[PDB]
Design a binder for this molecule. Structure first.
Ligand SMILES: O=c1ccn([C@@H]2O[C@H](COP(=O)(O)OP(=O)(O)O[C@H]3O[C@H](CO)[C@@H](O)[C@H](O)[C@H]3O)[C@@H](O)[C@H]2O)c(=O)[nH]1
Ligand SMILES: O=c1ccn([C@@H]2O[C@H](COP(=O)(O)OP(=O)(O)O[C@H]3O[C@H](CO)[C@@H](O)[C@H](O)[C@H]3O)[C@@H](O)[C@H]2O)c(=O)[nH]1
Lengths: 416, 417
């Protein structure tokens, strides 16, 4: 059997049950290709209510998080049995904000070596439970996960599936990450690797299966500039060890972008993309393509965007962002068609050629306003709008300029 | 020696001369086909110095014209010497605004028969000068037409040219008419024909040649237009029922139907007029028929039939810039269409079972939509869509972009006029 099959058989067969109820916190089930050996589907829902419920501990590593450690721990101090904060010798409060308001949370210490894995890996060895789940301090643990976490541990042990576990992280942007690898069995197998952009690897160097489970965490400045300068130092390091690695070329390339060094980021993204072709962990391959495409787009480099676009479209055909960059290009072509039309109208007006409608060629000025407003070309519309030579056209334009003046401050009203 | 060549031997040479000054008040000159008997050039400039300067009477027919008759007669009184004013028994004052300030302008009377040419007769009779000039109550004789009139009458009497004379008459819309036919020699050769849309004709009903001269005459309107039209159409329909296949009248009746908001029917007459001008001799208003049918076809969003009448407009009057106006409007409508079809092709897209790697919220798609419908001025949907974006920084920039164009509108709106 495949876990996929087991879930189906449990749908019409045993949707009554608890094994079912708790197996539906697993999003990711049709991805699990390993045989789960079973000899009776009936004995299984029955043996699941007899199953042990495991212990989860919650590891947080903090530096100067005076601003956000309170809301963080509040989200989380009721959902675990043991919470371990790992102070890297904060210069501000943090430590004592924790000590009075949160009496039950262990506080430990560790000087910062420039290694998120070493820190993270301390809390692993300090931790007493039999699963761990990591959460960072600017993050917040949805009210919705109440009583759900250990249910996820329980099923995965009940089938004894080896995996790390990703909840959904929702960016403050609303962007929703699902390769987060934040929870895993505390059983000697599996330890963080990497000075930065670290993730749990099962220690034969690995790459464990990832259950996306149905748990959620939410956000809680222009200190992005701060954090990024910190990480690029670490990323460039990790990359100099493996200078041809597509993941590291992309990671570095990305942070270069974040430090607006876009021309240099495009080079690393172009190299990352060449190297993913024949390379096994293709997880961030898409992230390189859609970033190189936006940067190429932002530099009005349509030929190279089209080339990379065809790659994104053949390598990931069900990615909607292909349709995004194609739209963006048509809309560019339309701008030029508008401009070219604005330009033959000017060429027309400057002949000897007479008008039978309005000898003042003043109806042409209706189209040219219309057409340069559309092009956002207020420079040239303000102009054209003086060259008008008649009251009742002027009378016509100002009354139409107002009804859109007031349609704007109507939509501008009800956003913020 | 033709006339346009006499003007080349003055412009090149005899160029400070009094003949050349008065002859540059004639615009229409290379059109004058008749040849002229000269001695030399010299003989001809000096004969002009010893020539004359004829007299011009100014004719005005009027009905209830209380509001404009004062401004009118001002423009004219210091410029003609004799001006007759034919009242048609106007029920309001009018006649006595003329009494007061304009004592030397000889108010004659006449009962109104529905015949504009006939009213123009009765002023040709009473007139005593050599040339006549006509003007209407809603026009103002331009300030800068100072003593230019009789220089026109001189040059035309000197070469003893037969013709009618057209000043430029300015619409309330700023448009300049130059087939106006307002001045002619009072030598029993020229006279108005036609109950309405009268013009001066030779006595064999032929068509006097039209010098366009360099005189400006302006305007003074709101909704007297609907009542003037409703009167004129009564006459026009009569004249039409006489030659019911005459394109000039098919056009005139269609035009007035239009001015009375009977557009659906105005097009039917414009179409027949355009069909009949093909052959027909006097094609003066052929162009006016086409461009009015085109502008109405545009208003009704009938682009298929617009294109077809635009072709005819283009083959017949290729140098009319109004061709390009209509081709432009079409091209631009096709743009709008491509845009809205993209708006929808984008919409279909961000529903499918299809994910984004850039932003799960697809909020970047929604920004492209917002930007289409701002361009499409579909402010309706700019509102819906901007409610469903969850990234506060984009919602901030939509706020700041709208403010940009809000400010720039309120800026261009200021310095119009
Ligand atoms: O010297 C430090 C710096 C940070 N932290 C804490 O550890 C986490 C690091 O997160 P952060 O300061 O937010 O850096 P980011 O770049 O925003 O975090 C991303 O990048 C890190 C570096 O790989 C990852 O560990 C995180 O999972 C990932 O959210 C946070 O809880 C910090 O408070 C420390 O304990 N010591
Ligand atoms: O029973 C009338 C009605 C009007 N008028 C006067 O005649 C002139 C006609 O001008 P208007 O009343 O403004 O009519 P429109 O339709 O605006 O004028 C156009 O249409 C008329 C009919 O063809 C022409 O006389 C004009 O030259 C032409 O400008 C004006 O001075 C009127 O005051 C009369 O004499 N008798």
């Amino acid at each position: 059997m495949k876990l996929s099959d087991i879930y189906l058989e449990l749908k019409k067969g045993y949707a009554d049950s608890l094994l079912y109820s708790d197996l539906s916190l697993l999003v990711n089930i049709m991805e699990y290709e390993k045989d789960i050996d079973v000899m009776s589907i009936q004995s299984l829902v029955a043996g699941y209510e007899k199953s042990d419920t495991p212990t989860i501990t919650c590891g947080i590593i903090v530096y100067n998080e005076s601003k956000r450690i309170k809301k963080c721990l509040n989200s989380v101090k009721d959902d675990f049995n043991e919470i371990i904060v790992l102070d890297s010798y904060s210069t501000d409060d943090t430590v004592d904000i924790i000590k009075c308001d949160f009496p039950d949370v262990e506080i430990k210490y560790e000087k910062w070596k420039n290694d998120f894995s070493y820190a993270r890996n301390k809390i692993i060895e300090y931790a007493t439970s039999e699963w761990i789940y990591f959460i960072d301090a600017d993050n917040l643990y949805s009210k919705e996960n109440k009583g759900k976490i250990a249910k996820v541990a329980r099923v995965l042990e009940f089938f004894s599936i080896d995996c790390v576990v990703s909840p959904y992280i929702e960016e403050y942007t609303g962007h929703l990450y699902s390769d987060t690898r934040r929870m895993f069995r505390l059983n000697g197998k599996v330890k963080f690797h990497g000075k930065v952009h670290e993730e749990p690897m099962n220690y034969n160097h690995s790459l464990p299966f990832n259950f996306i489970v149905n748990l959620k965490v939410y956000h809680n400045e222009n200190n992005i500039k701060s954090k990024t300068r910190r990480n690029i130092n670490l990323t460039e390091e990790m990359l100099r060890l493996e200078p041809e690695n597509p993941k590291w070329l992309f990671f570095f390339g990305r942070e270069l972008h974040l430090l607006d060094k876009d021309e240099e980021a495009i080079d690393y993204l172009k190299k990352s993309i060449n190297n993913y072709k024949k390379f096994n962990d293709q997880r961030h391959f898409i992230d390189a393509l859609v970033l190189l495409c936006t940067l190429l787009l932002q530099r009005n480099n349509y030929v190279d965007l089209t080339l990379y676009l065809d790659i994104l479209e053949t390598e990931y055909p069900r990615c909607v962002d292909v349709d995004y960059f194609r739209s963006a290009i048509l809309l560019v072509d339309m701008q030029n068609k508008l401009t070219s039309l604005s330009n033959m109208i000017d060429e027309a007006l400057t002949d000897e050629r007479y008008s039978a409608i309005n000898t003042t060629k003043d109806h042409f000025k209706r189209i040219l306003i219309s057409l340069n407003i559309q092009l956002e070309n207020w420079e040239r519309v303000k102009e054209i709008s003086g060259e008008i030579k008649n009251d009742n056209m002027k009378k016509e334009i100002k009354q139409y300029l107002a009804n859109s003046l007031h349609n704007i401050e109507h939509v501008l009203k009800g956003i913020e």
